[PDB]
């Protein structure tokens, strides 16, 4: 009855203008994930450089002269691929490419002392038996605060951080592909695992059994999975190529809504476009779910599933020609296609305005809200930019 998808929904009519607020280039390698704290006071980013950095979201509002990572954890070793905040902002989970998963506590020490991060619990996965963590999410069943993470050997294990025991254990069929991402239902009844072979496998968490396995017609890799904010049985999976973000109803397996932002013919299974969606954010808004997607095309696109005609590019290359979005039904899937409108001196104060967009693949997308709603995006070149 109290279904909350987000602790802080975006302000009504929130349309990100793409104005760069803070340019953070502290990471030495590709940023793998972005997460926001439950209180929205902090957000964290992990990178291949082996460091996890926690940032004060309130400080990115421009009120502070210099915004740098509030805390730097580097004791995990290897390449830190993903991180997630745990309910109440008191715990931070991290994973490394060595197979080590450690939960570090971010102590909100009173000013002026800087918060200290210390490893509270540690788990070392056997590189031969479990492998490294591919994706990780945390959900609290009230009695047990369980961090669910997926390994290379197909083991999805939920470690209950309260009792240190495994709350539940699922074994994915590796024939369905390598686990690439997963989503857990807001109602905590079920979870869906996406794979590298394009298989979307549905798992019922109440019974802890795999119920159905479906494969994308193109077999393209699933990049990010999210539960649909409105449809209780729909999962939004961004697939490799054509910047396609498709929403599938797992009960029937039919693709209900699909975004086709590629130069290939819509729904084309042949020679896909090398742009792909990397980050997916779904907010119910207030009945018209909005999805912000950013990927290898270096563009952050806001697709409005209710009024596709109003979708627009938040941030991208300054010279990007104007694009229009049209709604069309193709092969039974409602597909909104991005059509590049063929663009057919003004005095410039100073040099040509520098491009504010990212210069490399945007690897992940997340949002945080302080006085205003902000979108934080990180790129594979190691630059994290916070946009309003």
């Amino acid at each position: 009855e109290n279904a909350e998808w987000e602790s802080k929904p975006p302000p009504p009519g929130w349309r990100p203008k793409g104005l760069l607020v803070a340019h953070l280039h502290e990471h030495k390698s590709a940023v793998n994930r972005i997460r926001v704290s439950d209180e929205h006071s902090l957000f964290a980013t992990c990178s291949n450089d082996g460091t996890v950095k926690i940032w004060n979201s309130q400080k990115m509002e421009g009120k502070t002269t210099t915004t740098r990572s509030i805390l730097t954890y580097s004791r995990i070793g290897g390449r830190v691929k993903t991180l997630t905040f745990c309910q109440g902002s008191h715990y931070l989970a991290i994973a490394s490419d060595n197979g080590a998963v450690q939960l570090l506590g971010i102590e909100a020490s009173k000013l002026p002392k800087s918060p200290k991060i210390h490893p509270l619990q540690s788990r070392i996965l056997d590189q031969k038996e479990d492998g490294c963590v591919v994706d990780m999410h945390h959900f609290n069943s009230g009695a047990q605060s369980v961090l669910a993470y997926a390994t290379v050997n197909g083991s999805l294990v939920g470690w209950d951080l309260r009792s240190s025991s495994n709350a539940w254990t699922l074994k994915h069929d590796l024939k369905s592909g390598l686990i690439t991402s997963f989503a857990v239902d807001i109602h905590q009844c079920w979870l869906c695992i996406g794979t590298s072979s394009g298989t979307m496998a549905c798992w019922d968490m109440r019974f802890q059994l795999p119920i159905s396995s479906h494969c994308h017609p193109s077999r393209a890799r699933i990049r990010r999975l999210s539960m649909h904010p409105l449809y209780q049985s729909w999962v939004i999976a961004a697939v490799q190529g054509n910047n396609e973000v498709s929403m599938w109803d797992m009960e029937t397996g039919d693709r209900r809504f699909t975004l086709w932002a590629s130069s290939a013919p819509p729904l084309s299974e042949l020679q896909p476009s090398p742009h792909s969606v990397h980050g997916i954010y779904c907010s119910p808004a207030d009945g018209n779910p909005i999805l912000l997607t950013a990927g290898s095309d270096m563009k952050i696109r806001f697709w409005d599933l209710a009024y596709p005609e109003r979708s627009y590019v938040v941030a991208g290359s300054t010279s990007s020609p104007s694009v229009s979005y049209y709604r069309k039904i193709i092969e039974g899937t409602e597909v909104v296609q991005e059509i590049q409108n063929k663009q057919k001196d003004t005095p410039r104060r100073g040099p040509e305005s520098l491009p504010v967009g990212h210069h490399d693949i945007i690897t992940d997308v997340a949002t945080f809200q302080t006085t205003q709603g902000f979108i934080v995006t990180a790129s594979r070149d190691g630059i994290v930019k916070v946009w309003k």
Binding site: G131, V134, V152
Partner: protein
């Protein structure tokens, strides 16, 4: 009849033992492939970045 049944059962058991061994090897291949597949996905993202 018993001798023939025993012979057929022995052949079925031998063929089944090979099937279980192949199934375990196939599972191991999927594990190793998963490690190579993670690397392939990592390299494709790395290559595009470079």
């Amino acid at each position: 009849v018993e001798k023939n049944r025993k012979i057929v059962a022995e052949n079925l058991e031998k063929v089944q033992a090979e099937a279980e061994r192949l199934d375990q090897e196939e599972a191991q291949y999927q594990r190793e492939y998963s490690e190579f597949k993670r690397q392939q996905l990592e390299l494709d993202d790395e290559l595009k970045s470079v």
